């Protein structure tokens, strides 16, 4: 057999120019898109201010329009999903990740407008969903769209253009290219059988988008924790501990998200209007909390910097944790178009921080700075729920810039999966596919 | 479908027995990577309490500054030709092959051979890295336990082998993230799904990095300091630089390859026509390492100096070529030592120069050569060894200039994008193929 390999080696890294060139067109498109989405989202969360402030005198009139808006939109969201693209609803990565193994279609001529405008409402309203996930999906479709519009055929160019579309997407989302790759090839990628995804193809894609994103988002990051202190080897074990905690709570949060999404099915049975109505319901709810305690609502990003600094008191932390631990489930589990990738970071950050403060006072001789713990854990609730450590560790670094904490960040995320494993749980992203894959059949 | 649905629900489940072993492995690799690195220096040191002792009589210097690097270089080749022919050279082509099960892991041989062996080639002053050598010393370590504990099952043979490499690659550059991205972008059997447990590797990598930090704390291997940044209007410049690496990438490959043939004739396969040719190039190096060190040795030390802009356009090109030579002549000579590390130096040096040119070319981009000296520190990896992602990240891992990530990629990418469209192949795979085909028949 060694006769073949010897020929396969000498025939490596040869990816058709036609493919590479397309991954470029794709990567590019994804970017422009990821941008406009992100742009549109804000623009609305904005209007929802030139609303409140206009009626900032009559308190009940506020709390009122601070519900209606996030309700009218959230609904509009669910609608554009239940009536045009049931596949959109929820993250959207379980699908792309499945569509890779060829177990789900990529109805882009549907999903795109649906997921786009759709989440524009859910997110542009104030719900507890990220916009990253939604993009990963919006991305792949973009890849597909070209694949179809140029009918270049051949597995390679169907799994490749699909994968890069994702990566490009994930990247332009956090302005993090390295993550967008490590991701596709640690998670999305068909987990059990060699595949025709051209790594290099992805890169060009990722890049092309990050550039596109930098074209409209330069001079400002999404987070800016600033160089935190360092971490001595005698304080390493502390990050392991924090890791283990994430490890036990990782699968749990997974049960909830999962089951909770069932217990939320009863309320509407599958009825477009029992949903849309329940939609603007949680939606409006959020928009309200987003003007009575915003750290419980919205993306959650904005409170990461504040959290890492140590501006939240042990009290305000725990409160914010729980509150979100709830708004998050109730929003994602409700099949609304939006993801739980981003908001998971927030929880991570917040949980980590707290662990820090405890540590700080526990041993003042380690000269700790909660901020570091608020980082060893920013992506740990990713290394337990979504079990994609390597993608997290790197996504964090990618946008937190504290490589000095690489040793801790790993020892945590590792310890994370090391307990998210030894205690049930599974890739919250895989489980979703499986279910939505088994429910596909087992129903005929 | 039904299968998949059961496969998903059965993911990330790696036997506690495996994980626990990857740990013992990782650990061992570290302590090892350390003592190696420690010993190497110790020698490059003695070769000072030698020269200085005879720093009065010039020719007496240039003399003992050859004999030492000769006596050792030989001792190296010897412990290889007579005890482990598989060691000689990098050592990665093997491990990478041993993964697909096309080469054996004669650890009870390789370990002492490669170790003490390269301790001489390197500890003398040859143009070979110590990284590669360790990747190999690593896998074996992984093997050794596999055997000593006869835990059987592909998974625990491909896993403990892989992590052993990673752990090794890591403790080498104190770069964990690299040690992983590497195994799963290169070493990994390139064409068929495998039973290597990612998580298994991590625990391994970590365990070694910790082990390395235990004895190497408070000091990095490189310290370029936060360089400036890079505006989107100076991006294309890094593409250009990338394309240059992309054309010279395969070329340097031809040479390394062929040159290792043209170096075969001199000894035919004779243990003594080698050993003699060994301390020949060996002694040569040790000499240059006291008449122009930037042409000899690991080459690390001159990366910082290079990135700063301390070398003039003259001294750069000279240092490039000189090394472009000493490197081939040393690695291609099947001496136990790798070309991973020294390839960085070339990259850095080539990059820098490109910088200075740029700087004066357009002073309106307010460039700083230093950044180009980095978009390319690992670009001659993204062409020779065609492992961009592992490079990009190994650089960052120990350069700390994430602000340059956009450039660093656009180069390395542009690198393989030409190393491709112009012949060339994974200098690491080609070696295996050859050393695999030269096997059957």
């Amino acid at each position: 057999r060694r006769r073949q390999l010897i020929r396969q080696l000498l025939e490596r890294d040869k990816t058709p120019l036609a493919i590479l060139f397309m991954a470029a067109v794709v990567g590019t498109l994804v970017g422009l898109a990821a941008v406009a989405f992100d742009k549109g989202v804000a623009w609305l969360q904005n209007q929802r201010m030139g609303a409140l402030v206009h009626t900032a005198d009559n308190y009940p009139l506020l709390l009122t329009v601070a519900f209606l808006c996030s309700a009218v939109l959230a609904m509009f969201g669910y609608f554009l999903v239940r009536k045009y693209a049931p596949e959109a609803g929820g993250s959207g990565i379980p699908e792309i990740e499945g569509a890779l193994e060829d177990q789900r279609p990529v109805r882009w001529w549907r999903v795109l407008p649906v997921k786009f405008f759709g989440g524009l409402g859910t997110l542009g309203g104030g719900m507890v969903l990220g916009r990253q996930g939604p993009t990963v999906q919006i991305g792949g479709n973009i890849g597909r769209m070209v694949l179809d519009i140029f009918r270049l055929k051949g597995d390679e160019a169907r799994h490749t253009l699909l994968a890069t579309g994702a990566a490009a997407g994930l990247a332009a989302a956090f302005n993090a290219p390295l993550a967008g790759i490590l991701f596709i090839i640690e998670e999305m990628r068909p987990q059990f059988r060699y595949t025709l995804i051209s790594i290099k193809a992805v890169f060009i894609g990722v890049i092309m988008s990050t550039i596109m994103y930098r074209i409209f988002n330069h001079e400002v990051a999404l987070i800016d924790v600033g160089k935190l202190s360092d971490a001595p080897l005698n304080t390493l074990w502390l990050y392991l501990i924090l890791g283990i905690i994430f490890g036990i709570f990782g699968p749990i949060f997974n049960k909830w998200v999962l089951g909770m999404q069932d217990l939320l099915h009863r309320v509407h049975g599958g009825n477009i209007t029992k949903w849309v109505l329940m939609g603007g319901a949680i939606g409006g709810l959020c928009g309200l909390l987003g003007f009575v305690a915003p750290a419980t609502s919205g993306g959650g990003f904005n409170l990461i910097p504040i959290a890492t600094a140590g501006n939240f008191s042990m009290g305000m932390l725990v409160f914010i944790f729980v509150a979100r631990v709830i708004t998050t489930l109730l929003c994602f589990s409700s099949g609304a178009p939006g993801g739980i990738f981003a908001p998971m970071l927030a929880l991570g950050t917040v949980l980590g921080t707290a662990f820090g403060m405890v540590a700080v006072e526990l041993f003042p001789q380690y000269h700790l700075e909660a901020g570091t713990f608020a980082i060893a854990g920013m992506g740990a609730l990713l290394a337990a729920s979504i079990r994609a450590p390597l993608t997290g560790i790197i996504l964090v670094l990618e946008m937190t810039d504290n490589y000095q904490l690489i040793l801790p960040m790993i020892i945590t995320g590792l310890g994370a999966t090391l307990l998210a494993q030894f205690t049930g749980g599974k890739p919250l992203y895989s489980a979703i596919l499986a279910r939505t894959l088994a429910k596909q059949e087992a129903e005929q | 479908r039904r299968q998949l649905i059961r496969q998903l629900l059965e993911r990330d489940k790696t036997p506690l027995a495996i994980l626990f072993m990857a740990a013992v492995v990782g650990t061992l690799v570290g302590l090892a990577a350390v003592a190696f690195d420690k010993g190497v220096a110790w020698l490059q040191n003695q070769r000072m309490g030698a020269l200085v002792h005879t720093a009065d009589n010039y020719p007496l210097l240039l003399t003992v500054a050859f004999l030492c690097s000769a006596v050792l270089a030989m001792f190296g080749y010897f412990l290889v030709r007579k005890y482990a022919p598989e060691a000689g050279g990098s050592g990665i082509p093997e491990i990478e092959g041993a993964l697909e099960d096309q080469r054996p892991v004669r650890w009870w041989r390789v370990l002492p051979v490669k170790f003490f062996g390269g301790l001489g080639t390197l500890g003398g002053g040859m143009v070979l890295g110590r990284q590669g050598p360790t990747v190999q010393i690593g896998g074996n370590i992984g093997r050794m336990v596999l055997d000593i504990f006869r835990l059987k099952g592909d998974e625990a043979r491909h896993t403990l082998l892989a992590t052993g490499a990673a752990a090794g690659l890591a403790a080498a550059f104190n770069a964990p993230l690299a040690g992983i991205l590497f195994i799963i972008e290169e070493m990994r059997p390139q064409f068929r799904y495998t039973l290597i447990s990612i998580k298994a590797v991590f625990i391994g990598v970590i365990m070694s990095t910790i082990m390395y930090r235990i004895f190497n704390h408070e000091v990095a291997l490189i310290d370029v300091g936060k360089l400036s940044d890079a505006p989107l209007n100076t991006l294309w410049l890094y593409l250009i630089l990338g394309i240059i690496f992309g054309i010279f990438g395969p070329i340097f490959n031809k040479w390394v390859l062929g040159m290792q043939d043209l170096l075969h004739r001199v000894h035919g396969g004779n243990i003594t026509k080698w050993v003699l040719m060994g301390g020949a190039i060996g002694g040569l190096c040790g000499l240059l390492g006291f008449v122009a060190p930037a042409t000899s040795g690991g080459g690390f030390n001159l990366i910082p100096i290079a990135t700063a802009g301390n070398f003039s356009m003259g001294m750069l090109v000279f240092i490039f070529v000189a090394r472009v030579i000493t490197t081939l002549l040393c690695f291609s000579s099947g001496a136990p030592g790798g070309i991973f590390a020294p390839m960085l130096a070339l990259g850095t040096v080539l990059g820098t120069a490109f910088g200075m040119v740029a700087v004066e070319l357009f002073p309106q981009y307010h460039l700083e050569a230093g950044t180009f000296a980095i978009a390319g520190m690992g670009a001659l990896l993204a062409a020779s060894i065609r492992a961009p992602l592992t490079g990009i990240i190994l650089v960052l891992e120990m350069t700390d200039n994430y602000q340059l990530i956009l450039p660093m990629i656009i180069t390395g990418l542009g690198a393989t994008l030409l190393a491709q469209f112009t012949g060339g192949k994974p200098l690491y795979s080609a070696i295996l193929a050859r050393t695999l085909a030269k096997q059957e028949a």
């Epitope: 001079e219 | 309106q364 307010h366």
Partner: antibody, heavy 120, light 107 residues
């Protein structure tokens, strides 16, 4: 972010004056500092620019050492030495902080000013 | 070195009016900048990269142009816009400023 430059004043033809510019409210390093002068009534004319590590320093088309820009990052201060001054050198001297958008650098935060009058 | 020459040397218009000032380059430039200088103050970075208002610039202001000729505009100018605007380029070393345009308000 305050850019306060002192030094200016009265100097007799063929003289020399060391204009100073103390920075505060930001990281002096990572920053390219420059000077630009405005002649009473007239417009602005770029003098020089000196990168962080001061490993680069350029000036407008003006001879040998009419100008000598330097900086002591240890004191976050920018300097400017004008020698053999002449009436054409009487103007308002500003020290700006340099940055860029897409990359075609701009004069970010201009300091106060300091005036140099050449006269006997 | 590039010779930027701002068209109206001096101009006056009554607030709420639409005013536009030009800035031509002898050769070719790209991503021009604009600085606003009110009496008694050092210049202030107004518009940049041809049309990126700076953090704080009223959305009243707008940048434009291309290669050989650029401009800066004020849709409905207000009285607090009285000042001297300076276009500057650095798309070709050494950088160069314009002759300036002095806006004056009619009341």
């Amino acid at each position: 972010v305050r850019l306060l430059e002192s030094g200016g004043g009265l100097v007799q033809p063929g003289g020399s004056l060391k204009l100073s510019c103390a920075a505060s409210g930001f990281d002096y390093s990572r920053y390219w500092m420059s000077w630009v002068r405005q002649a009473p009534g007239k417009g602005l004319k770029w003098i020089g620019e000196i990168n962080p590590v001061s490993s680069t320093i350029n000036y407008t088309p003006s001879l040998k050492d009419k100008f000598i820009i330097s900086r002591d990052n240890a004191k976050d201060t920018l300097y400017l030495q004008i020698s053999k001054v002449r009436s054409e050198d009487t103007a308002l001297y500003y020290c700006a902080r340099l940055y860029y958008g897409y990359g075609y650098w701009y004069f970010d935060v201009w300091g106060a000013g300091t005036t140099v009058t050449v006269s006997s | 070195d590039i010779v930027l020459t701002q068209s109206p040397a001096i101009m006056s218009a009554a607030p709420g009016d639409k005013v536009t000032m030009t800035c031509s380059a002898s050769s070719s430039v790209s991503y021009i900048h604009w600085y606003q200088q009110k009496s008694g103050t050092s210049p202030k970075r107004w518009i940049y990269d041809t049309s990126k208002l700076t953090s704080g610039v009223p959305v009243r202001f707008s940048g434009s142009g291309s290669g050989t000729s650029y401009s800066l505009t004020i849709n409905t100018m207000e009285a607090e816009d009285a000042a001297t605007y300076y276009c500057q380029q650095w798309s070709s070393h050494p950088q160069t400023f314009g002759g300036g345009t002095k806006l004056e308000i009619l009341r």
